[PDB]
Enzyme design. Structure first.
Site, PDB file in Angstrom:
ATOM      1  N   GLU A  82      -0.387   8.065  11.739  1.00 33.68           N
ATOM      2  CA  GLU A  82      -0.873   8.016  10.369  1.00 33.68           C
ATOM      3  C   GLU A  82      -1.060   9.412   9.788  1.00 33.68           C
ATOM      4  O   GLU A  82      -0.704   9.637   8.666  1.00 33.68           O
ATOM      5  CB  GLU A  82      -2.200   7.260  10.273  1.00 33.68           C
ATOM      6  CG  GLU A  82      -2.088   5.748  10.423  1.00 33.68           C
ATOM      7  CD  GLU A  82      -1.334   5.060   9.288  1.00 33.68           C
ATOM      8  OE1 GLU A  82      -1.118   5.672   8.215  1.00 33.68           O
ATOM      9  OE2 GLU A  82      -0.965   3.885   9.479  1.00 33.68           O
ATOM     10  N   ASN A 110       0.656   6.387  -2.673  1.00 31.48           N
ATOM     11  CA  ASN A 110       1.439   5.155  -2.612  1.00 31.48           C
ATOM     12  C   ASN A 110       2.090   4.910  -3.976  1.00 31.48           C
ATOM     13  O   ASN A 110       1.623   5.429  -4.986  1.00 31.48           O
ATOM     14  CB  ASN A 110       0.546   3.995  -2.183  1.00 31.48           C
ATOM     15  CG  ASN A 110      -0.069   4.235  -0.819  1.00 31.48           C
ATOM     16  OD1 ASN A 110       0.625   4.634   0.098  1.00 31.48           O
ATOM     17  ND2 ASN A 110      -1.372   4.026  -0.689  1.00 31.48           N
ATOM     18  N   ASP A 115       2.140   2.430  -5.998  1.00 35.98           N
ATOM     19  CA  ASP A 115       1.245   1.781  -6.975  1.00 35.98           C
ATOM     20  C   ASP A 115       0.160   2.714  -7.557  1.00 35.98           C
ATOM     21  O   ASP A 115      -0.735   2.258  -8.257  1.00 35.98           O
ATOM     22  CB  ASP A 115       0.595   0.515  -6.376  1.00 35.98           C
ATOM     23  CG  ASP A 115      -0.411   0.817  -5.257  1.00 35.98           C
ATOM     24  OD1 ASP A 115      -0.581   1.976  -4.831  1.00 35.98           O
ATOM     25  OD2 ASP A 115      -1.057  -0.130  -4.793  1.00 35.98           O
ATOM     26  N   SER A 146      -2.216   4.270  -5.965  1.00 36.73           N
ATOM     27  CA  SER A 146      -3.300   4.443  -5.014  1.00 36.73           C
ATOM     28  C   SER A 146      -2.934   5.576  -4.033  1.00 36.73           C
ATOM     29  O   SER A 146      -1.773   5.995  -3.978  1.00 36.73           O
ATOM     30  CB  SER A 146      -3.579   3.146  -4.270  1.00 36.73           C
ATOM     31  OG  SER A 146      -2.518   2.819  -3.407  1.00 36.73           O
ATOM     32  N   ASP A 161      -3.801   7.277   0.123  1.00 30.91           N
ATOM     33  CA  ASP A 161      -4.323   7.121   1.485  1.00 30.91           C
ATOM     34  C   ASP A 161      -4.952   8.423   1.942  1.00 30.91           C
ATOM     35  O   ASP A 161      -4.390   9.485   1.708  1.00 30.91           O
ATOM     36  CB  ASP A 161      -3.200   6.787   2.459  1.00 30.91           C
ATOM     37  CG  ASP A 161      -2.538   5.454   2.166  1.00 30.91           C
ATOM     38  OD1 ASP A 161      -3.062   4.645   1.386  1.00 30.91           O
ATOM     39  OD2 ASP A 161      -1.476   5.214   2.733  1.00 30.91           O
ATOM     40  N   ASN A 194      -6.883   3.537   2.412  1.00 25.12           N
ATOM     41  CA  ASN A 194      -6.293   3.395   1.083  1.00 25.12           C
ATOM     42  C   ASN A 194      -7.347   3.180  -0.029  1.00 25.12           C
ATOM     43  O   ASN A 194      -8.257   2.366   0.124  1.00 25.12           O
ATOM     44  CB  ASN A 194      -5.319   2.196   1.135  1.00 25.12           C
ATOM     45  CG  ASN A 194      -4.581   1.957  -0.164  1.00 25.12           C
ATOM     46  OD1 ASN A 194      -5.024   2.332  -1.239  1.00 25.12           O
ATOM     47  ND2 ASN A 194      -3.447   1.302  -0.065  1.00 25.12           N
TER      48      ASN A 194
END
Ligand SMILES: [Cl-]
Length: 129
Positions: free
Chosen positions: A35, A46, A48, A50, A52, A59
């Site tokens: 990750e 991301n 959309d 958003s 992380d 998220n």
């Protein structure tokens, strides 16, 4: 901060992740590896809009507030920036709510694709714990 492999496992263990909901400690280390590459300051956008955050790439859509993810939830009741700290406490506590969700560790795409069904114990070989 960029953790060493064993250093992270020790810290994860101290904060009660080893076998939290049946996931042995090797799973969490493997997830962190892929990750974030063990870096508490990792961020990734991301599609959309958003974002992380941190060692486990939690998220903003659901879990933390960053003030720029309109219509999102703050289910861990924290600013996303708390997840970037050298102290992994907030990240671990928020991961505990995530993994209790119903979907277990499948919530982390890297875990599902890179850790699930592998020899995860290898990630803690040689560590004093
Ligand atoms: Cl949010």
């Amino acid at each position: 901060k960029v953790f060493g492999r064993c250093e992270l496992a020790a810290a994860m263990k101290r904060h009660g992740l080893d076998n939290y909901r049946g996931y042995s400690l090797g799973n969490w280390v493997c997830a962190a590896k892929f990750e974030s590459n063990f870096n508490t300051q990792a961020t990734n956008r991301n599609t959309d809009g958003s974002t992380d955050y941190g060692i486990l790439q939690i998220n903003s859509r659901w879990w933390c507030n960053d003030g720029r993810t309109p219509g999102s939830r703050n289910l861990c009741n924290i600013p996303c920036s708390a997840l970037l700290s050298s102290d992994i406490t907030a990240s671990v506590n928020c991961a505990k709510k995530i993994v209790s969700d119903g979907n277990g560790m499948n919530a982390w795409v890297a875990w599902r694709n890179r850790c699930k069904g592998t020899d995860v114990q290898a990630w803690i070989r040689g560590c004093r714990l």
